[PDB]
Design a protein around this nucleic acid. Structure first.
Lengths: 182, 48, 126, 79, 49, 136
RNA sequence: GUGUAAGUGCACAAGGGAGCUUGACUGCGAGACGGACAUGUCGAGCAGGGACGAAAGUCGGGACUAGUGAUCCGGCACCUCU
């Protein structure tokens, strides 16, 4: 009935491209994306919790599902951080919602970064997943720039069924990732 | 998918200054979102 | 040469069911007069046994494998209901009227839910 | 010059009160213990303070299961 | 006294039935508890006097 | 003067002197060694006086290994005190030595000087000891 | 990691989280542990009336062992006693 284009792209072109270049023994070893999770660490909530309420709504409008406020599980005195206080918010994306986020970030959002220069291809994790962080939330279209109070950044990491880095880098770069070339 | 706890998800279309059009969903209540620079527009994606 | 890195979901689900079936088995046990009714559920069928844990022997069994249940035009719950009746009649033919229910580590609802009450109405007092 | 020590509690008389091979009535206390060193088996019930006792008459018999010490009661045969 | 002894009276027959303790600073208000009223023979709400 | 940096318990029962050594009965590092023959608490200072004695005779070359470490404390009550009123404060550190234990091991090119040097160390130890080499 | 000292325990969790709730009950208690005596401790189970659970079932405070004071004298409420 309905089909996201990037998933339509992955199923049709990307899936065969990976198979041809990596010559898999079986079809099920084709690497796909599993989920994309976005978290933002406040850290300044150790003093004033008002920032946490501001951080929650930013992610909710960014993605499409309200964050899960993350209590702090350690009491560190130097941070003036106590047990159980909210310190970060995280959003998990599965199903069609990754592609819509993944496409909207690739095509529109990522070019909108101030003096955008690309992302290093060595930001992998060794197991075949990518992580990379940001510094501002005003970049997104869905957040009104007047409504912002302070640039709070946010981290995006993608999890793929790839095992090694080459398989992962093949998936994301062929998916349209503006990788830097070292 | 919990009923009311989530922001309302709006079906929208992306229109850019180069004439490129995209179809997706988003949070934007207007239901239609415009953009000045897209992936095709962005020089970095074109090698420029 | 493919070396899988992480746990496969099938084994994570399989191990978790076994872990949460043991904690169920702490209190539930069967006896020659009150046999434990073990339930096993799969994406295509369902199985039940009457187990007497004193010596670890099975009194009666039923499953969606039998073509009689397969020929049921209904749904998976409709197959489950047919299974629930089948084990009950086999139970009375073996001389038992009261059992305990080992839900098997699955959350009691849906297909299992249809299984338990179908046998309950058939005369299995539990 | 003085000692700051010298305080002690009473001796609680723990231990295994009923040993293996003994005939016990219902409710007799088998082991008086603090933790679950000995774990209940068949026809052996656990008290509030992890004291073990017997729910059915019979003969004690210590056993093991899954690497855990257990205490059981075998139903001695009526004459 | 932080944890002063309190007594519970049945709401119906006003019999002072049970006696417990509670943290007055944590729960300054009176206590709402359902308990077995012996003369009534049925669980009735109990009010701390 | 070897003392432990820290010890879990500072006041301890006297180490018992029964039996003979089960471990460390054979020279492992050096070529010669001193083997005990009687039970006695080899204290902290006696080790220092003996180790210095070895170094003075062998002069420059060679290495000395001390397999005994005095980590067991011993206490004494303050002088001129009646009995009672608790245990005394720890005073000196001793290491319990049983017959067969090898205390020191010395490596040196020539045998004659090495045996003489170890002999001087023996005279600084309360126990009757003998010098034992590495081979069978 | 277990509110709290140490020890015995606990990963099957007694550890982390969530929903409902007040058994942190009434009348009793076979059989026992420990003891000079006085104290102290465990208790399956029955009945009434409940809580959670689909059910089996569990629940007479807390993972266990400390957090307390006999008798006389007197206060308060109830009782079909004098």
């Amino acid at each position: 009935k309905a089909l996201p284009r990037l998933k339509q792209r992955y199923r049709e072109e990307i899936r065969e491209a990976l198979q041809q270049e990596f010559n898999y023994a079986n079809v099920m070893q084709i690497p796909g994306v599993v989920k994309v999770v976005v978290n933002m660490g406040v850290g300044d909530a150790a003093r004033d919790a008002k920032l946490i309420n501001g951080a929650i709504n930013d992610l909710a409008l960014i993605t499409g599902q309200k964050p899960e406020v993350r209590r702090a599980r350690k009491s560190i005195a130097q941070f003036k951080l106590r047990e159980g206080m909210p310190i970060g918010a995280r959003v998990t994306l599965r199903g069609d919602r990754m592609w819509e986020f993944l496409d909207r970030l690739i095509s529109i959002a990522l070019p909108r970064i101030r003096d955008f220069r690309g992302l290093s291809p060595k930001q992998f994790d060794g197991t075949g997943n990518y992580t990379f962080g940001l510094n501002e939330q005003s970049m997104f279209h869905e957040i009104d720039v007047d409504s912002i109070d302070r640039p709070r950044g946010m981290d995006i990491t993608v999890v793929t069924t790839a095992t090694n880095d080459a398989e992962g880098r093949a998936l994301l770069r062929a998916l349209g990732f503006p990788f830097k070339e070292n | 998918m919990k009923t009311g706890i989530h922001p309302e998800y709006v079906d929208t279309t992306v229109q850019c200054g180069c004439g490129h059009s995209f179809t997706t969903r988003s949070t934007k209540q207007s239901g239609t979102i415009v953009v000045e620079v897209c992936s095709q527009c962005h020089p970095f994606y074109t090698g420029k | 040469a493919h070396k899988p890195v992480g746990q496969n979901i099938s084994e994570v689900r399989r191990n978790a069911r076994l872990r949460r079936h043991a904690r169920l088995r702490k209190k539930v046990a069967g006896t020659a007069e009150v046999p434990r009714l073990v339930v096993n559920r799969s994406a295509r069928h369902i199985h039940v046994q009457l187990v007497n844990d004193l010596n670890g022997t099975t009194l009666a069994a039923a499953s969606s494998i039998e073509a009689d249940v397969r020929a049921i035009d209904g749904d998976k719950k409709a197959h489950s209901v047919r299974v629930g009746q089948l084990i009950a009649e086999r139970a009375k033919a073996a001389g038992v009227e009261t059992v305990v229910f080992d839900r098997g580590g699955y959350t009691y609802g849906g297909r299992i839910a249809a299984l338990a009450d179908a046998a309950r109405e058939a005369g299995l007092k539990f | 010059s003085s000692s700051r020590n010298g305080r002690d509690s009473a001796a609680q008389r723990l231990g295994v009160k009923r040993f293996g091979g003994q005939v016990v009535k219902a409710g007799e206390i088998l082991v008086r213990q603090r933790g679950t060193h000995f774990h209940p088996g068949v026809n052996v019930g656990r008290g509030g303070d992890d004291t073990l006792f017997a729910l059915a008459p019979g003969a004690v018999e210590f056993g093991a299961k899954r690497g855990r010490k257990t205490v059981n009661i075998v139903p001695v045969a009526r004459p | 006294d932080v944890r002063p002894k309190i007594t519970l009276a049945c709401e119906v027959c006003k019999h002072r039935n049970y006696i417990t303790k509670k943290n007055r600073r944590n729960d300054p208000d009176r206590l709402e508890i359902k308990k077995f009223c012996p003369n009534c023979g049925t669980h009735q709400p109990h009010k701390e006097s | 003067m070897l003392i432990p940096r820290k010890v879990k318990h500072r006041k301890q029962h006297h180490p018992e002197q029964r039996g003979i050594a089960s471990g460390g009965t054979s020279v492992s590092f050096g070529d010669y060694g001193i083997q005990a023959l009687e039970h006695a608490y080899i204290t902290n200072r006696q080790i220092e006086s003996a180790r210095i004695a070895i170094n003075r005779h062998i002069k420059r070359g060679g290495k000395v290994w001390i397999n005994i470490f005095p980590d067991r404390p011993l206490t004494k009550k303050p002088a001129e005190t009646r009995m009672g009123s608790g245990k005394g404060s720890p005073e000196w550190w001793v290491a319990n030595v049983k017959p067969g234990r090898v205390l020191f091991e010395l490596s040196y090119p020539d045998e004659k000087t090495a045996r003489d040097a170890l002999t001087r160390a023996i005279h600084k130890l309360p126990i009757k000891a003998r010098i034992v080499t590495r081979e069978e």
